[PDB]
Amino acid sequence: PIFLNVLEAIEPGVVCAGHDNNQPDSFAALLSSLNELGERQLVHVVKWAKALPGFRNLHVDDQMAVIQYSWMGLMVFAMGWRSVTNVNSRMLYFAPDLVFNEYRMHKSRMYSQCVRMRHLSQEFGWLQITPQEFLCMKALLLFSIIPVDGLKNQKFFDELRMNYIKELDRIIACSCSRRFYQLTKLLDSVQPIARELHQFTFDLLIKSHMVSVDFPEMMAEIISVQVPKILSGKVKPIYFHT
Numbered sequence: 001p002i003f004l005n006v007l008e009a010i011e012p013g014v015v016c017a018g019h020d021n022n023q024p025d026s027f028a029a030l031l032s033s034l035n036e037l038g039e040r041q042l043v044h045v046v047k048w049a050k051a052l053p054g055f056r057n058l059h060v061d062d063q064m065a066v067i068q069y070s071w072m073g074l075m076v077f078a079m080g081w082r083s084v085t086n087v088n089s090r091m092l093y094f095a096p097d098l099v100f101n102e103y104r105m106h107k108s109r110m111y112s113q114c115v116r117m118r119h120l121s122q123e124f125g126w127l128q129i130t131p132q133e134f135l136c137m138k139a140l141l142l143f144s145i146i147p148v149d150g151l152k153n154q155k156f157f158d159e160l161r162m163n164y165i166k167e168l169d170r171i172i173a174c175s176c177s178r179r180f181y182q183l184t185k186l187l188d189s190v191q192p193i194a195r196e197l198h199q200f201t202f203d204l205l206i207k208s209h210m211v212s213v214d215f216p217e218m219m220a221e222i223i224s225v226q227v228p229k230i231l232s233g234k235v236k237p238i239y240f241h242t
């Protein structure tokens with residue numbers, strides 16, 4: 001099981017937000033901590049993606065683009081997994097030092113987005129997603145959002161994505177169609193969540209200095225240059241179902 005060996009081997013370890021849990025929960029503090037967490041996880045996502053089977057087959061520019069478009073979906077998917085794994089789904093396990101209870105979901109001003117993420121977390125439970133289904137789905141997520149004008153080498157991308165789909169199907173196969181159906185619906189359900197988070201972070205970046213939220217430099221760059229391409233519809237998710 002070469003493919004599965006790789007995905008398991010490359011899976012990132014624990015990442016902390018560096019949040020001060022001893023201090024009363026403010027909007028500014030919670031959101032600055034989520035931003036810092038995002039920046040730290042982006043480093044890990046980049047090294048993960050580069051080690052994925054076939055990833056180096058893409059043009060350098062497509063490598064960068066797929067990561068910049070997909071990171072929100074990928075991080076949310078992993079966060080959902082951690083959440084089923086560690087806590088119990090009233091809660092969102094962003095990091096060991098950054099666990100959201102309902103009170104925090106409210107103070108972050110992200111309550112409804114958090115409700116969507118928790119629904120995702122719960123779905124992993126209800127579908128009884130295996131660790132190996134999780135790993136293959138996460139890999140697929142990196143190849144599920146592209147510019148409508150195409151990538152530099154769209155042909156290699158379409159081939160990469162096909163191969164990850166085949167890998168998910170094998171992991172299922174090893175009825176079957178019911179399971180593939182359910183997993184593809186679950187993958188699709190990540191995309192509305194990512195879209196609402198993209199809107200939210202974009203708004204927050206615009207009004208950031210007003211509300212005293214810090215955006216690390218890499219975060220501010222991607223949210224101002226790449227996230228607006230998704231919100232304006234220049235970059236769109238690939239859905240399995242209509």
Ligand SMILES: C[C@]12CCC(=O)C[C@@H]1CC[C@@H]1[C@@H]2CC[C@]2(C)[C@@H](O)CC[C@@H]12
Pocket residue numbers: 031034035037038041072075076079093094095197200201204
């Ligand atoms: C990806 C992160 C951070 C990593 C993670 O575990 C999931 C989580 C989802 C909410 C994101 C956050 C990064 C910072 C964002 C983008 C904030 O600006 C608003 C929503 C936050």
